[PDB]
Amino acid sequence: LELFAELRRQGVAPTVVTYNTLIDGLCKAGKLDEALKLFEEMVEKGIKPDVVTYNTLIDGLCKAGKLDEALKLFEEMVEKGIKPDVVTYNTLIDGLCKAGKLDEALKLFEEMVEKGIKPDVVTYNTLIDGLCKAGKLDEALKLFEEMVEKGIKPDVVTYNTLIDGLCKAGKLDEALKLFEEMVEKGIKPSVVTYNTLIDGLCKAGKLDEALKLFEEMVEKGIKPSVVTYNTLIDGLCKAGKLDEALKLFEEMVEKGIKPDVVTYNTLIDGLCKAGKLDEALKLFEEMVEKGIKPDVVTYNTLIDGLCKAGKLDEALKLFEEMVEKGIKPDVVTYNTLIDGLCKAGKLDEALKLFEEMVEKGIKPDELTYRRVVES
RNA sequence: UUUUCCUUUU
């Protein structure tokens, strides 16, 4: 960082690998524009960006929601003669899945094979995840068979990903065979394995069992993470045990686990659904003061709670404040307000919010169309 | 030096 500038002012000409690490750090901080600037500066200095340089920027653009730009960057390396490698393909395949473009991801999966690149464990893990999320467990499980055929050994992320896919599909007991199957293979379960299973137990109404697995996990030596506690906080809220959810929130602190924005969003959502708007809004104040910045989910959640209560002025006030503070509204924000307005019979307010959403380039969905008190 | 798993909002 500054230490880099100091190094540079001693006349030391740093390796590309040094530049890459830096561009990587910037990307993962949210400082993407600074990353692209340093990209442009290495080029101006005659320092050639390599395949890792490109792979790093393609990922950060994808993670920033800029799949088009990452796509242009991919075209640019190919034009330069800088060959996309297995990581380039894995990275774009992941971005395409996360973006709803499974079909194009699977086209890249065929393209890499045509260039003599072998799909590897990450290639398979990413498509198995992308298929499971798309409702396609069966194809995911066929991809799981196929990797064993190519000689590629299912690892801990492969088992975790599949167990997540099975739990979301109702295949809870099946996930649990897989869990014993990975131990039988010498793959050690992580916190992620337990958290996944704990979530599936909660969603299936087995909070009893989910807490028993939480106890066993701590017993097997596995220290809970913030996700462990978020998942159990959510399940207690969804169950109607908000008091116990607040106890767990106290507890995680006692045990050294730092709450974060999802911890707040979750408690705020369960207080909202309970009708305890009072406490939700206070908890919202608490997170700012403690330095945890509310994200879009935080506003959406509070806006939802206020709309359902018929407190439209208060809900619009949080929308205004969110739009003020640089927090960008999404499809869920506008669906929530239109929903709220339609419910109240304020149909032209809602139609005028529909137009404004398009005005910001946010893509509507059936939800947006479906919602009409017209009928 | 870069890519893949789990929790929250309509």
Residue numbers in the entry: 36 to 410
Give the article text.
Containing a tandem array of 2–30 repeats, pentatricopeptide repeat (PPR) proteins constitute one of the largest protein families in land plants. Each PPR repeat aligns to a single nucleotide of the RNA target in modular patterns, making these proteins suitable for the development of exciting new biotechnologies. Within each repeat, the combinations of two amino acids, known as the PPR code at two key positions (the 5th and the 35th) confer RNA specificity. A typical RNA-bound dPPR protein adopts a right-handed superhelical spiral structure, with its target ssRNA molecule sitting in the interior cavity and interacting with corresponding PPR repeats in a modular fashion.
To verify the RNA selectivity, the dPPR proteins dPPR-U8N2 (in which N indicates any nucleotide) comprising 10 dPPR repeats with different 5th and 6th repeats with different PPR codes were constructed and purified to homogeneity. After numerous unsuccessful trials, we finally succeeded in crystallizing each dPPR-U8N2 in complex with its respective target ssRNA (5′-UUUUNNUUUU-3′), in space group P212121. Because the four structures exhibited almost identical features except for the RNA base binding details of repeats 5 and 6, we focused on describing the structure of RNA-bound dPPR-U8C2. In the complex structure, dPPR-U8C2 has 10 dPPR repeats (residues 174–523), which are capped by NTD and CTD helices. Each repeat in dPPR-U8C2 contains 35 amino acids, forming a hairpin of α-helices that both contain four helical turns followed by a five-residue loop. The whole-protein molecule has an overall appearance of a solenoid with a polar axis of 75 Å and a diameter of  50 Å. Although it has a similar diameter to RNA-free cPPR-polyC and synthPPR3.5, RNA-bound dPPR-U8C2 exhibits a more compact conformation with a helical period length of ∼70 Å, which is shorter than that of cPPR proteins (∼90 Å). We observed that water molecules between bases and PPR repeats mediate hydrogen bonds between the polar residues and the bases in the cases of uracil and cytosine recognition. Each water molecule between the base and corresponding PPR repeat forms two hydrogen bonds: one with the N3 atom of the pyrimidine and one with the carboxyl group of Asp35 or the hydroxyl group of Ser35. The N3 atom of uracil is a hydrogen bond donor, whereas the N3 atom of cytosine is a hydrogen bond acceptor.
